[PDB]
């Protein structure tokens, strides 16, 4: 062998020091609220964090699907404030849900409604 080897690393980041003080002993209950904007062939799902900015929130879950959100689910990072679900089906009521989950566990999901606009090969003049 030749003086073995190693792997140095160093860099700066923008975030707190994972303070243990933060409330991480319980799960993040339902968020402040959840807004959804139905689009022709898309849907801008905009949500908001819980008033309490002390609970450690790893990420949230976005469930969508006609009849029930269980159909499909999308997971993202906390930073993410809203998700634009593209390649969807117009003229259809999509049930979007949102639930806060952390290392402690999952919370209570929300119930919303978003009716995509009628494509009609040209929603103009409507």
From Swiss-Prot:
Widely expressed and also in cancer cell lines. Residues 30-120 form the Fibronectin type-III domain. It is found in: Cell membrane. Multi-functional cell surface receptor regulating cell adhesion in many diverse developmental processes, including neural tube and mammary gland formation, myogenesis and angiogenesis. Receptor for members of the BMP, netrin, and repulsive guidance molecule (RGM) families. Netrin-Neogenin interactions result in a chemoattractive axon guidance response and cell-cell adhesion, the interaction between NEO1/Neogenin and RGMa and RGMb induces a chemorepulsive response. Knockdown of NEO1 in C2C12 cells results in the enhancement of the BMP-2-induced processes of osteoblastic differentiation and phosphorylation of Smad1, Smad5, and Smad8. Conversely, overexpression suppresses these processes. The Fibronectin repeats 5 and 6 mediate interaction with RGM family molecules. Belongs to the immunoglobulin superfamily. DCC family. Interacts with MYO10. Interacts with RGMA and RGMB. Interacts with BMP2, BMP4, BMP6, and BMP7. This is Neogenin.
């Amino acid at each position: 062998g030749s003086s073995g080897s190693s792997g140095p690393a160093t860099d700066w980041l923008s975030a707190e020091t994972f303070e243990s003080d933060l409330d991480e002993t319980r799960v993040p209950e339902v968020p402040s609220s959840l807004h959804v904007r139905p689009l022709v062939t898309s849907i801008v799902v905009s949500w908001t964090p819980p008033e309490n900015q002390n609970i450690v929130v790893r990420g949230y879950a976005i469930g969508y699907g006609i009849g029930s959100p269980h159909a499909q689910t999308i997971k993202v990072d906390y930073k993410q404030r809203y998700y634009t679900i593209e390649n969807l089906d117009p003229s259809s009521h999509y049930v979007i849900t949102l639930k806060a989950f952390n290392n402690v566990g999952e919370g209570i999901p929300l119930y919303e409604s978003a009716v995509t606009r009628p494509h009609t090969s040209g929603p103009s003049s409507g």
